[model samples]
Target: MDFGKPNQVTVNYLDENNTSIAPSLYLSGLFNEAYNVPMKKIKGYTLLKYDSEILGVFTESPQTINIIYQKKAPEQALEHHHHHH
Candidate 1:
């Protein structure tokens, strides 16, 4: 599974059910033709799909890009400053 690239990257987009989503890979960059070819494992950060569904191939080290849920929170403290001295 070596594409001869320096970095081996696997792209995964997990749904709510923890399933992988199939992304389209356009050949001409004009959205002309596409294929859901699992993993092509090519060289140097190829433009696989939209939002990186096609990812890239690595040779030196294995890497994975997992698209999942993220939580948002406030940075400031919970306390307020409404008190008047």
Candidate 2:
């Protein structure tokens, strides 16, 4: 979601078991708030929420996974990523 105006955002910290390690959304040990929510929660939306569960995790080839996992493409994929001319 574009806020229209650029601004700073706070992120909460989590543990290996998906538990909030920090009391607030900001702290020293708390890295970036990357994997807070699971993909199932926001599978189709503008905000791609990531948390500790999957921060820097990367796949070599998403295309290969998409085929092997037999995951269907979202109906709004192309429409959502559209840029205005």
Candidate 3:
């Protein structure tokens, strides 16, 4: 079977507020590095992945990928925090 290119996936990284965030250039690099394919960046999203075994890129539209950046709870923070003596 002749699958398309390996780097043609549209990815959209959105914040917790459903707002589109400009992904750093390094993101494209990372994707290409991981998938070993030449990725393309257009608009505010990147096309990294086409089709084949493993993580396939099958979407042509912006895939809204939500990312959460919330603060830790007081208790949780204290538990995870370490004091510098």
Candidate 4:
């Protein structure tokens, strides 16, 4: 008898407001296969928080992970006004 299982893991990069910072990542592995997912370095953003799973073994069920990021800097006024001279 022979058997095999396929698994997938999705990673998302988000800001403090849980908005998408960058394109999400899609990873896949065979059942029982070990994996080490890495974080991304986006311009003008710093790492804030993420799920702790530096190392993991893929299972039959798929999983998702979110890597939060904080804006590098906040500038300008909160309100926006358009005035033509």
* Candidate 2 residue lDDT tens string, 1-85: 5344222233433332344444323212222322332222223223323433333322221110100111145555534355673
Error of 3 at 40 (Å): 16
Evaluate model 3: give its lDDT: 0.36
Each prediction's TM-score against the native?
Answer: 0.29, 0.20, 0.26, 0.67
Between candidates 2 and 3, name the one with more favorable lDDT: 3
Residue 38 lDDT in candidate 3: 29
Q: How many clashes (backbone N, Cα, C below 3 Å) per candidate?
A: 2, 6, 3, 0
Quality of model 4 by C-alpha lDDT: 0.72
Which residue pairs does candidate 2 place in steric collision? Answer: 34-50, 34-51, 35-50, 35-51, 35-52, 36-51
Q: For candidate 3, lDDT tens digit of each residue in 11-73? A: 334432344454522223233333433233334343332334424443432232333232223
Which residue ranges in model 1 land beyond 4 Å of their true spot?
Answer: 1-6, 23-59, 69-85
lDDT of 1 by residue, 40-67 (tens): 4332223333345443323255345554
lDDT (tens digit, per residue) of candidate 4 on 1-85: 2345337777788877688777777777666778877677787678988888736777666677888887767645333356783
lDDT of each: 0.38, 0.29, 0.36, 0.72
RMSD, each candidate, Å?
Answer: 14.6, 15.1, 13.0, 6.7
3 or 4: which has the higher TM-score? Answer: 4
Residue pairs with clashing backbones, model 4: none
Superposition error at 47 for model 3 (Å): 20
- Per-residue lDDT value at 70 in model 2: 16
